[PDB]
């Protein structure tokens with residue numbers, strides 16, 4: 469007997485995740501099976517994506533030594549059956565208003581900022597870099613949330629100071645880079661490049677920094693196949709390239725530039741995408757997804 473999700477109060481929704489109040493000091497952090505591509509949440513869910521990404525997050529939490537917001541096991545009796553395997557019980561924290569980002573490679577808004585200004589989030593970079601260039605050391609490239617449906621706004625370190633305090637900002641920078649460095653080296657050892665990552669921190673009652681997000685999922689982090697890493701061109705998304713290629717190919721009937729909501733995916737593409745998630749999970753964790761809890 470587990471409670472119903474309807475026993476808990478919904479407090480937040482993201483594109484592909486949900487948050488619920490369990491009591492005054494705990495929340496329920498729920499991954500869904502929805503997937504986003506080209507800034508659209510697609511009509512077609514990916515089977516088991518919520519469970520797979522939750523397993524991934526749990527693995528990486530176990531790998532990292534930093535305090536985190538997990539407040540119970542993946543089978544905690546407070547978790548409803550309906551979300552079992554894709555929801556975790558977490559401690560309620562005072563969240564810090566910073567999207568902490570580390571970039572090991574230059575792509576996306578990071579590359580664009582560099583191409584426009586020669587710098588990213590206050591970091592003046594060497595000349596001659598381009599798409600998927602390795603950054604060494606990794607860059608702290610923080611961002612702030614914007615309006616609904618808008619991309620996060622890249623900001624520099626001074627902006628983070630103004631948001632959370634000088635000493636805390638230094639802590640966010642150091643911890644974000646330490647955590648990314650550890651995770652990325654682990655993943656690369658297993659054949660996957662984590663090109664970048666984003667996560668949020670909160671502060672507990674004693675004032676300590678606590679990692680409080682999904683961590684190193686293909687949604688929070690660019691997953692790349694290391695065996696095909698080729699600086700100078702756009703790398704395939706380990707998990708979403710089948711989806712991307714179909715949507716923008718000759719069979720979808722959809723024009724990406726038209727900004728109209730994309731059509732549903734072929735079942736075959738959704739199944740193939742689930743397999744990519746399982747492959748990435750099992751390679752990185754060294755575990756079997758068949759052992760991960762579910763309904």
Ligand SMILES: Nc1ncnc(-c2cnn(Cc3cccc(F)c3)c2)c1Cl
Pocket residue numbers: 480481482485486487495497498537558559560561562563670680681
């Ligand atoms: N441990 C915490 N304590 C207090 N607040 C949060 C919190 C609030 N918002 N978010 C972002 C978010 C995470 C998942 C699903 C969403 F819809 C939104 C996280 C957390 Cl993780």
